[model samples]
Target: PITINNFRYSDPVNNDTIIMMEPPYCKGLDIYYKAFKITDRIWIVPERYEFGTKPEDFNPPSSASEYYDPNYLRTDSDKDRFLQTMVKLFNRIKNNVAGEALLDKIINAIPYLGNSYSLLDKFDTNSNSVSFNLLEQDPSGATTKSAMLTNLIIFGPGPVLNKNEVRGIVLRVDNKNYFPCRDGFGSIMQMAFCPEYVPTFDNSKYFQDPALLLMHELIHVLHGLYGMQVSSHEIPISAEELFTFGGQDANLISIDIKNDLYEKTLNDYKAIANKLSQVTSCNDPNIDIDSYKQIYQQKYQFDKDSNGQYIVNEDKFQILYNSIMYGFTEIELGKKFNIKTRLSYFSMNHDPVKIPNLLDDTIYNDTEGFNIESKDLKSEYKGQNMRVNTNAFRNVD
Candidate 1:
């Protein structure tokens, strides 16, 4: 593991409270930054890399595909490109007035990096700024970091924030690890990234700006720090649907899965919530970490078949809760920044962001906002790479 502070609180896992990670490391980092009028300047450190190849036994390669080189990264020792790639990504997204404008609402509304002051209220913009570093380690090495990304332990592929506690945002390495990298990897937990596929190897130009993806994670980072400050108390199902389903490949997964499974999906999930409801009662407003974990453990039940293998049943409702809140925040953000769907698909498709439960409070109500129109989505994305078991114990219709 990329040891957090060269100190083993015995384990970054069991003891991060004492050893949080930051810019300090074995290698040196080249820092880059940009400040804004509305908020403090931001600093970012990108990861770096090196590679090439050829073979004497190789038939003087006839074409690009004929090359045997996979162009592996050169970590020969720890210090080549200390900071990481994606260093340029911040500027890419930061320059987007619309996108940055949307985030500024959150910054201005909530406490800045956990301070009592909001981005707009605080002064000394020159002295106050946060620095985030990218990772040079490859995917496998980076995936190992999830254990310590506290915000990721509960959510997968998304992000959570305790903004005051941490000051920077870590990005995924590329389009590959950027989305749904795995069931356990979320915002910060996903290792810092080096764009997996840099368009031209010549280094003169890079791939398209990660405008959307960068914005998605940045929101998560803000949530982690700001507790999801928004214009409304409702969840933005409309905004999140785009993130969750808009980019999905409906042609394959078929709206059939959610349509077929939603009712049952809702039920199975509701069951878990019902179980947790009994213990929601607590004497304190803030729960200790251990107590919170205890509540989490009791939220669901597991069973084992005659063979002795543990059978798993996910707390679908909880997952839904996270998505709903995420959607809610997105919607509020849109309105706050005046980037509603009518103007920018709430920043995505230029479609007005809609919330599922906003119009109707039914828990599992299958409606426009809550459901995916598969036929329409066939052209949306390829759907899941290969259909896996959607009905394992799906308990869905």
Candidate 2:
């Protein structure tokens, strides 16, 4: 039932409401996730993606890039592999709810969008989303597709993906078990699904739900590219928002940039540790993050403590206030897609913007958050309200 116009549906049993692209659509994290599902209806793809095959499965095609072959770069085949895993994961989950029809939908979908692009470079500011950057380039350009469905998945209603190529896509499959690293990490990239340890999976108590992992990483990709910041504010709240259109330091979702921002923010927070109690969150704001109404109305000027931390809280929480406005830009996205999703687990972690520990379980545990392995994942997760209050925005955003 693809409701085109006047499309509104609500499920009282599950307490769900959805709108189909109609303007003034409801907005929230949950809405975005649902919208993406609706998008799947029109999204075209082949019967399956590349996951069933491994990088080693493909013979080296002469057309492959020497600089980035299986041993080094993500060959054109590598991108397809990523797409495969994505679909595999999607379909695997769908088996429980929808059906394999989800994977079968795109078999003949024309022109695959090529892999690789700076996340920032892929954005169509006008559409407020990634470009329809799949298949080949426009008649005027010579760009080409690396895979078949990359375009459709990332398809936007606007321009082709051509902007500042600072590198945005990443692959995070486990190399220890399968493919090895080619070119090392980038400030922007694609990755395979290699969690450090084989925590409980398939709901065998490994981790609760595989969708949770996918959803978590997906949130990371969406938020880092669209929202998310860590600044002198403090803990998870020590963040701010930035302009997506302008060339702000805010860019794609790469570990380096994330680490850099985390470190920079940590330094700023430590710098003002001594002034902990000086200010507090007041109603007024210099950048009001009016997620509901007029959120971040920046009320105060910059006043440094004895150290050099910004003292602009509700005039008091000046730095923290500024961090939320400048770091997390979901407010703007909410206006655009008018969407919602499961907030990343990081929001509740002690240090939400913590670094990646995907390399191994020992490293992962020692890291700031989600340090648990299969040992007590079920129990720990069950007790913790990893979920956020619908009113999370008002508290810290």
The lDDT values for all models are 0.26, 0.25
Candidate 1 residue-wise lDDT, 137-237, digit = tens: 33455422211112221111101110001212222344432221111111121223322211111112111112233444455444333222121112343
Question: For model 1, what is the error of residue 58's alpha carbon versus the real structure, in angstroms, after optimal superposition?
Answer: 18
* Lowest-sum lDDT 10-residue window in model 2: 156-165
Output the worst ten-in-a-row residue range by lDDT, candidate 1: 155-164
TM-score of 2: 0.24
lDDT of 2 by residue, 160-260 (tens): 01111111332333443211111111111122332111112121111222223333333223222211222233333322222221123234334564565
TM-scores for every predicted model: 0.29, 0.24
Superposed Cα deviation of residue 45, candidate 1 (Å): 12
